[model samples]
Structure formats: C-alpha cells, structure tokens
Target: DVAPLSLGIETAGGVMTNLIDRNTRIPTKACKTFTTYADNQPGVSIQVYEGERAMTRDNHRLGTFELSGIPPAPRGVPQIEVTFNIDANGILNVSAEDKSTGKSNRITIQNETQSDIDRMVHEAKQFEKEDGEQRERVQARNQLE
Candidate 1:
C-alpha cells in the first residue's frame, strides 16, 4: 500500500497545515475543522498535499479548492470540516463541509501516470501467468501421488 499526506492552505490564517502523513497506509482518512475568519465571507480555499512535514511547503501539493455560497456568519463562528482519504490504488480523495450550513466539498487526486498504469497491467499479467503455471505443477504432483 502506498501512503500520502493531505496538505491544505488555510484561507483565514494564510498558513499551510498537513492533514495526513506519508507511508501511513492506503484508504486512510483524516479531518480538520476550521472556523470562519471573517463575517459575510462567501467561501474558503482548501489546498491539499502529500508528505510528512507539518507545513505544506516541504510536501507535494496535490490540489486546492474553494467552498462557495456559504451563508453569512459571524467571524470565528462557522466551522469548516476537511477530510482526506487515500484509496487502495494510491489516489487521494478529499471532502470538506461547512458544519453550520451542511455544505460539502469533494475532489479526487489521480496522480498516476500512463507509465504507472502500464507497469501495473504488465505486473498483473506476469503474476497471473506465473501463478497459473505453479497451480498446474501442483495438480500434476497430486495425480502422481
């Protein structure tokens, strides 16, 4: 399993916080909650990353998003929830929600390249062939016994 970190930009504070850590495992999820920084703000930007560092500057920035149409709220009152999930194939999926308004955000990070896909296909084929041959050999021995 491949592990990746979730990195995001904090809109109100202009800082970067890492939501996930590298080599942790696949199909993992983590969340962070943030409060509204300004009254009447319509939206917030979320930047995600994959790495071990606490700050996103040292990690690979995966994606960014803005949750819009947020209803007006007092400063530091609205809560935004961020969630990070990595799939079994090493792809990152992110979701965010306004806890007060029930607004949600979601995105998928497909960092796999064409070469990587090709390699995986090839490896799967090779494994299938080898396993088939091994199974046949065991069957032959069983017949002899």
Candidate 2:
C-alpha cells in the first residue's frame, strides 16, 4: 500500500476524524454527516489537516472555516454534511451543507495553492531524477541477459 498524503478533519474534543485515509487512490470523494452539539448552535467549524498523526496539532494545517446560518435547536437537531473531495492534482476541496436550513457553504479549500503546486512539482522532479539511477542499477545487476 502507498499513500500520496494523509487527509482528514478535526472532530469533537479536538480528535482527528479521518475521511480519506492514506494509500488510497486519487480522484476520490467522501462525506460525513454530523449534527449540532448544543441548543441554539449558530455555527460549526471545520478544520482540515494533512499527515499521519493521531492529534491534529501534530499535523499540517491545510485550511479551516466556519459554517453558519444554522437554526436554533437542541443538540443533534441540525443535520450537517461535510464533503472532502480530491482531484487528480493531489488537491482537496471541502464543503459543508446544512440539511436542516438548506444553508450551505464552501469552506476551507486549499487545493492547487502556490505552495502545493511548487511542492508537487519539486517532488515529481526529484523522483524522476532518482528513478533514472534506480533503473540503471536494476539493469546493471542483470547478468548474462
């Protein structure tokens, strides 16, 4: 198994909720639905993380945002759905939808940022450079072929 990168969300009590685990294929989408934790809750915060860490504090922060327009209700009254979608470019976009009030927001999308593109390009070049020598070594080891 191999992973491009680790991606997940921060859950209640600041625990890490993993939507997309490492070593999975690209161009994927995952959704997790949750509800309000308190009465008259006005909004919800979504935090995105990258890297394999039990706690979000140890991982890299991709982005974070708050979804508003929620109705005043008791805990677990509002239905909220969060989606994590990844494209072919190792980029991830997150969105939140309030099923109760039909209130939705596109929050914390850091895909294809300048830093992301640069890091992707840099890693690609470095891999290709090393692959050349790695291939030669494999071929050079073949005897009486």
Candidate 3:
C-alpha cells in the first residue's frame, strides 16, 4: 500500500463510518451510505472535521455543506451516499448523492500546499503520541475495521 488512507474518523456514538482510514496504499474512493431520520427531510448536512476525537465539538471543524431537494421518505429509507476525496495538494472534495431522489451536492476544502499537509501530518503524529500518553493508553491500534 504506497498510498495512505483517504480519510479517518473517530465516532462519538453517532457515527464514524471512517469510510476511509489512513491505512490504504492505493488511489481509491471511500464511501458511506446513510438514511434520513424524518419522513420529510429538507436537507442533508455534512460536516467536515480534522482530528481524532469522539465528539464533533472536540475536533477542528473544517467546514460544512448541505444537500437539499431530497425525496420525502421515512427513516432508514432513501439511500444517501457520502464520499471523501483528497488530492495530492491536500484539497478535500466532499460529495453527497441521493440515489433515491436523484439529487446531489458538493463542497470543496481548499488546503494549502503539500508542505502544509506534511506539517499537519507530522503535527498530528506528535499530538497522537501526546494523546496516547496523556490518556494513559497502553497501546496503539490500526487497520480500521
């Protein structure tokens, strides 16, 4: 696996789907499908964050987008698929598709240069180490399932 993961996530009980963890080594597309909660959902909101926290509030909020024009359907109905893609320049492109309603939405996360990404990656590693020791963790785990 020469290519790392497309994305990673930590769940605060609601979700992580971590659709793509930093373990893959190939160019790929990671996706997670979800359903609405109400019968007449007006829109779908997708929040983007960067960090390893269970709660969204604890992580750094990068941005958010909403997908509207969804077909009215009850919970556990109407498939909505979310996908994450990051280019070599650290630009994140998020998209959501409503396969049932045939509507979709998209948003772009513009990051700096590859140098910035490298720095972020390194800083994240350091924070991850500090977090492990701070929380008195015994070990590290990977290969997200």
Candidate 4:
C-alpha cells in the first residue's frame, strides 16, 4: 500500500509546499531549499504537514523541529535544505540542514491506523474542492493589494 496523503512542509505565507506528491509508491525522497524570513536570523523552524489542502493550517501537522546554530545572516542569505524521505514501510523521515553551518534536525513520523487513513482519503476529496475556492479568494485578495 502506498501513501494516502501528500507530504509537505509549511513555508512563509502559511502555504503547504509539497515535496512529495501523494499516491506514489513508497521509498521516495525530495529536497527543497528555504531561506530565512528575517534579517540576522540564527535558526529556522521546520513545520511538517500532510494533506491535500492548499494551506498549512488546513492540513494535518506531522511535527516540527528547529535547525539552530546558524550563523547570523540577512534574510534569504542562509540556505536551509529540507528533505522528505519516505521508506518502503511508509514511515516518513524529515530532515533539515543549514547549508552554511552544517547544523541539522530531523523527525520521524508515520500514518495513523487504517481507519484514520480512510477518513483522510475522503477528507482530501472535500478539501480539493475547498482548496480551489480558497486559492481564488487568495488571488483576488492579492489582486486588490
């Protein structure tokens, strides 16, 4: 059995940036680079989530971790590479590394019971409809700004 939910991390603007699309066979990995949100930032917090929603708050939170020991730098100067790795058994291992300082953090999480997975599959379908509407709403709001 493959994954029932997509794997992603929360980014600025509260978006769930998907690293691994759902329904793929297991034993997959993806990497993405992220930057600090403010100047003189010394650390970065990685918030992992899983779902089909367009936003992080609507998705199911997997866990969170921090990559500290980063050398102070201006916004976007520090490069943080985050990785989402799912093994054959369907266990997810998320890791983040500060490219400059080599500081790192990781967390491992897995799916709930089969019943939970079943429920989420149905929720994803409903969220798919709402996500489109939410995206349009956000777009309209941005256009007005």
Kindly list the per-residue Cα lDDT of model 3 for residues 1-145, writing each as its tens digit.
Answer: 3223235333223232355555444345667776665667767677766644333354556677777887666645767778877666656777888887678888887753547546655665667765445434422221111
Q: TM-scores across all candidates? A: 0.64, 0.70, 0.63, 0.80
lDDT of the candidates, in the order given: 0.59, 0.66, 0.57, 0.76
Pairs of residues clashing in candidate 1: 7-48, 7-49, 8-47
Which stretches of candidate 1 lie above 4 Å from their native place?
A: 4-14, 53-58, 113-145
Query: What's model 4's TM-score?
Result: 0.80
Best candidate (score: TM-score): 4
Q: Sort by lDDT, best first: what order?
A: 4, 2, 1, 3
Clash count of each predicted structure: 3, 2, 1, 0
- Give lDDT tens digits, candidate 2, residues 2-75: 23556777665444567787678888888888776567878888788775555457567788878887878776
Which pairs clash in the backbone of model 3? Answer: 3-25
The 10 consecutive residues of candidate 2 with the worst lDDT sum are 136-145
Q: lDDT score of model 2?
A: 0.66
Off by over 4 Å in 3: 1-17, 23-28, 113-145
* RMSD, one per candidate, in order: 19.0, 15.4, 7.1, 4.7
Say which candidate scores most in lDDT.
4
Query: In model 4, where do residues sit more than 4 Å from their true spots?
Result: 111-145
